Amino acid sequence: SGFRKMAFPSGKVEGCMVQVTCGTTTLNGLWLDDVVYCPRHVICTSEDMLNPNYEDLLIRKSNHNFLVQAGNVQLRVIGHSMQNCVLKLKVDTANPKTPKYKFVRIQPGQTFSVLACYNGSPSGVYQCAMRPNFTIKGSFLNGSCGSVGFNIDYDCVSFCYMHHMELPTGVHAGTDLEGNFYGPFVDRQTAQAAGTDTTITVNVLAWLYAAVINGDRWFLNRFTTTLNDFNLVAMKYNYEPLTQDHVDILGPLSAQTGIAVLDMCASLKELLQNGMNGRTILGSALLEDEFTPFDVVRQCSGVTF
Amino acid sequence: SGFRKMAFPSGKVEGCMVQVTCGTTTLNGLWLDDVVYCPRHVICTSEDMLNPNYEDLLIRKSNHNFLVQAGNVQLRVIGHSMQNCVLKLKVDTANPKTPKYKFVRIQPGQTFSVLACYNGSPSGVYQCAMRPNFTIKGSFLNGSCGSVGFNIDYDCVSFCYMHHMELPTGVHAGTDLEGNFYGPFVDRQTAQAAGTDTTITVNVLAWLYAAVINGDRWFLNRFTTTLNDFNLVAMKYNYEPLTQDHVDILGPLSAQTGIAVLDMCASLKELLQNGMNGRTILGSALLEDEFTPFDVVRQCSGVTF
Ligand SMILES: O=C(N[C@@H](C(=O)Nc1cncc2ccccc12)c1cccc(Cl)c1)[C@@H]1CC[C@H](C(=O)N2CCCC2)O1
Numbered sequence: 001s002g003f004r005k006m007a008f009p010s011g012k013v014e015g016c017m018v019q020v021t022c023g024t025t026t027l028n029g030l031w032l033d034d035v036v037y038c039p040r041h042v043i044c045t046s047e048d049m050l051n052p053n054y055e056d057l058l059i060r061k062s063n064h065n066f067l068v069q070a071g072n073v074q075l076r077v078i079g080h081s082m083q084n085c086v087l088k089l090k091v092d093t094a095n096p097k098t099p100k101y102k103f104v105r106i107q108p109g110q111t112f113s114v115l116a117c118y119n120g121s122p123s124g125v126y127q128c129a130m131r132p133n134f135t136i137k138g139s140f141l142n143g144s145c146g147s148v149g150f151n152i153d154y155d156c157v158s159f160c161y162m163h164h165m166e167l168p169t170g171v172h173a174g175t176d177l178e179g180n181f182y183g184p185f186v187d188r189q190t191a192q193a194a195g196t197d198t199t200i201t202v203n204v205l206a207w208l209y210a211a212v213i214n215g216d217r218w219f220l221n222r223f224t225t226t227l228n229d230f231n232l233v234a235m236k237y238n239y240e241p242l243t244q245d246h247v248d249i250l251g252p253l254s255a256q257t258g259i260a261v262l263d264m265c266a267s268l269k270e271l272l273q274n275g276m277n278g279r280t281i282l283g284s285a286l287l288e289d290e291f292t293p294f295d296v297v298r299q300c301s302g303v304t305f
Numbered sequence: 306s307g308f309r310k311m312a313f314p315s316g317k318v319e320g321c322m323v324q325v326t327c328g329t330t331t332l333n334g335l336w337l338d339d340v341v342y343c344p345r346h347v348i349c350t351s352e353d354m355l356n357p358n359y360e361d362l363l364i365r366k367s368n369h370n371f372l373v374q375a376g377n378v379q380l381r382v383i384g385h386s387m388q389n390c391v392l393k394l395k396v397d398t399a400n401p402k403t404p405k406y407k408f409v410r411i412q413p414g415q416t417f418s419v420l421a422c423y424n425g426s427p428s429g430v431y432q433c434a435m436r437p438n439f440t441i442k443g444s445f446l447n448g449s450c451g452s453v454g455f456n457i458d459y460d461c462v463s464f465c466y467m468h469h470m471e472l473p474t475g476v477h478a479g480t481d482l483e484g485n486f487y488g489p490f491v492d493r494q495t496a497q498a499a500g501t502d503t504t505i506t507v508n509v510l511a512w513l514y515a516a517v518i519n520g521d522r523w524f525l526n527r528f529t530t531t532l533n534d535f536n537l538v539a540m541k542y543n544y545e546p547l548t549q550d551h552v553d554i555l556g557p558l559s560a561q562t563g564i565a566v567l568d569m570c571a572s573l574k575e576l577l578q579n580g581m582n583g584r585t586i587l588g589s590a591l592l593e594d595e596f597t598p599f600d601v602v603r604q605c606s607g608v609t610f
């Protein structure tokens with residue numbers, strides 16, 4: 001019993017964090033095999049930030065300009081290349097702590113663990129979700145650039161995010177491990193803003209099924225809804241449309257609890273209309289959207305209370 | 306910017322988790338140097354858990370009855386002893402991954418990271434607080450017994466909790482690493498209940514200072530209060546008394562934000578008497594009490610490990 005926002009154990013990722021210094025800029029790198037991956041903006045000047053020409057800045061750099069530190073050991077850079085917004089530094093030593101890994105690009109609504117680092121030193125781990133507007137609501141300060149997002153399903157680490165910047169609203173933007181940004185963002189200090197954010201409907205439904213599994217049913221009602229009527233209502237509360245894919249994905253939780261997806265959609269419609277009335281669901285007074293259907297099945301029991 | 310429930314990096318603790326099997330019972334052990342620590346109830350079956358005389362049950366066991374597995378390697382048990390509610394299994398191999406560590410007993414209100422494990426395999430890390438009623442609101446399933454709670458100070462791991470059981474309300478009970486329970490609990494199947502819980506006042510105040518630091522000031526007012534008048538109000542809402550020690554501990558956050566501790570108490574008083582009025586603080590519609598004043602300073606400063 002119980003339901004917590006749970007992050008993956010960070011040990012396999014801690015053994016990969018290094019510090020990357022270029023001139024006066026220091027940030028974090030991810031050392032996998034003989035390559036260190038970091039944001040390419042590590043080569044920028046405090047002037048260059050508005051309209052940097054990264055190809056022009058990189059051609060002027062030599063291997064010995066990049067200082068890479070793994071703990072108290074200096075790694076030797078023997079090559080460098082740029083792939084989209086990520087810099088790849090070839091080093092002379094393969095990381096002996098390299099876990100089994102994959103690089104995965106995630107879709108909005110997906111969750112992951114963030115190992116927040118400063119100066120190549122891990123300081124904390126938290127769980128978060130890729131928002132529908134492609135931003136993440138993280139907890140990052142100056143020097144956190146290069147910190148990574150990951151999932152550890154079985155013994156393989158799937159790297160899905162690398163932190164690049166903070167937007168004026170306090171939210172964060174970054175890339176996958178191939179250097180492609182999530183969202184319409186660029187690694188430039190030009191006026192950029194996060195689009196209007198919405199609630200991840202499929203995740204709120206999964207969380208309502210987690211509450212039922214943990215023995216709470218106060219919010220259920222005798223009603224059902226069509227998918228179209230549910231979406232007409234959901235849109236008015238800034239909720240993402242629920243697709244037939246989402247309904248299919250909620251199938252296992254629906255079979256376990258005995259509550260049809262469209263009957264759970266009717267409870268959600270009623271919750272959005274009535275509020276909570278001084279009550280909580282899984283210790284929360286708001287509808288939680290940062291637990292996917294997969295997270296609920298992984299964390300919750302296979303037997304409903 | 307951002308404020309997340311953040312756990313310590315779990316790597317130093319993951320290298321200590323082992324699986325302990327005794328008869329038909331499997332649970333988690335903590336391997337430090339040549340000793341494996343685990344709940345003593347591992348020596349109890351479904352009949353032995355009703356009225357357990359642990360010395361009588363232990364005297365009947367031999368070293369080869371305890372199966373200890375570290376990854377895919379079987380450790381050899383060469384001795385066994387009991388200290389309070391924890392079993393200490395002497396093994397033939399010192400753990401080469403043993404970090405610098407201390408065993409510490411924490412007080413209610415203090416926070417720690419939990420590395421939840423099943424079959425000696427870490428599955429998740431979350432942050433939580435020792436409630437004033439000595440329970441923890443964790444997330445645990447069958448097989449989680451022996452999972453540990455910890456904090457990190459520089460490079461030293463301070464082990465403060467070992468999971469033993471779940472109470473009928475879904476909350477959890479356990480011991481320090483010397484086998485002394487937190488709270489009036491015993492390790493056996495019998496009628497046990499968590500006492501009435503209270504809110505950790507010093508932690509709510511720290512979280513209000515974290516909200517101010519992150520740009521959330523709607524709840525501030527021009528008013529102040531005496532500690533005596535605040536404690537009368539707090540007692541009416543099931544809030545723990547605020548002592549002069551708590552006021553002294555909030556000193557740094559008070560100096561940084563420019564809001565006196567008793568000035569912040571007048572805000573908390575108005576929030577208790579009038580509510581949030583449809584508004585949120587740090588993305589929450591409830592007053593959050595699982596961040597200590599130290600956690601706030603650490604997360605809003607970037608301390609690394
Ligand atoms: O804000 C800065 N850097 C980036 C950034 O956004 N970093 C941060 C990330 N997360 C949380 C943060 C919280 C508070 C302050 C910063 C945070 C940034 C800005 C613009 C574009 C990009 Cl791609 C990256 C400052 C100012 C320029 C300096 C910097 O990155 N330099 C590169 C080389 C010459 C100096 O550091």
Ligand SMILES: [Cl-]
Pocket residue numbers: 105106107110
């Ligand atoms: Cl995905």
